[PDB]
Design a protein around this ligand. Structure first.
Ligand SMILES: [Zn+2]
Ligand SMILES: [Zn+2]
Lengths: 157, 153
């Protein structure tokens, strides 16, 4: 099941960058195998620097479910969530995070060096409690290739 | 001026908690000396756990200026911004943050221990770039008093 939803997140990333909504990032929020929200980065479309894929999905899922906690839901992120997004995942009380590519894969094509200490377990003040799964196998390889694929698609533009 | 805009962020904190929009937290974004956004926590009003005062203010300022970066603006927060909000402040590229109450003041009234390493200078992977000012004196007194004053609210 993890492979299904992670690949849905990756496809959101491709769709969002293709239509110009934002960068190549996707996120899917799922409640007992039912998809609650399927989003990509909307920073450009919304003129909102907080509209990352994860934040957008959280906003949508909370509005759909009429509550500010998503404690029975899980989130699939095509890329490792940044500090803002990991903070939003913490605040939302999501029970599990599965992510596809390490942040280094995005930094490799020029994205900002902007990594969540609490995700990687390197903080003094901020600690995480939720279950975190870095994908492996086919899902991880597919997720990691998003960034070189996007850079190649826009190389001569 | 620093006192003026921090006091306005505290005023937003009180207004928001009084009308049930969210918790006792406010934020003000200014371009030199003009208010670009003045907001409070809207978590309850919007059913949105990301709608902290700072995030709400960033979104409104970016809409007002029609752009996703706020490198000419500064942000005043009634309370120390949390990891989410400090991340948002980084992404928006605000050039300066002034905040009134240390997170311990909110925690002492029963809010979650949820503190940004990058703001306190203890981040390993996340390093702040912007200038940060913790208020002192009367500004700190005003911002700390919010939590005692709104305890039963
Ligand atoms: Zn993010
Ligand atoms: Zn916050």
């Amino acid at each position: 099941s993890d492979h299904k939803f992670l690949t849905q997140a990756v496809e959101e990333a491709y769709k969002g960058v293709d239509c110009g909504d934002g960068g190549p990032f996707g996120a899917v929020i799922v409640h007992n195998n039912e998809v609650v929200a399927s989003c990509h980065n909307m920073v450009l479309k919304y003129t909102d620097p907080t509209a990352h894929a994860e934040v957008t999905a959280i906003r949508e899922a909370c509005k759909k479910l009429n509550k500010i906690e998503l404690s029975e839901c899980e989130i699939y992120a095509s890329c490792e969530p940044c500090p803002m997004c990991f903070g939003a995942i913490h605040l939302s009380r999501l029970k599990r995070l599965v992510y596809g590519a390490k942040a280094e894969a995005a930094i490799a094509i020029g994205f900002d060096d902007f990594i969540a200490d609490a995700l990687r377990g390197t903080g003094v003040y901020q600690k995480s409690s939720l279950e975190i799964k870095k994908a492996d196998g086919n899902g991880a390889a597919i997720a990691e290739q998003v960034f070189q694929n996007t850079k190649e698609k826009f190389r001569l533009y």
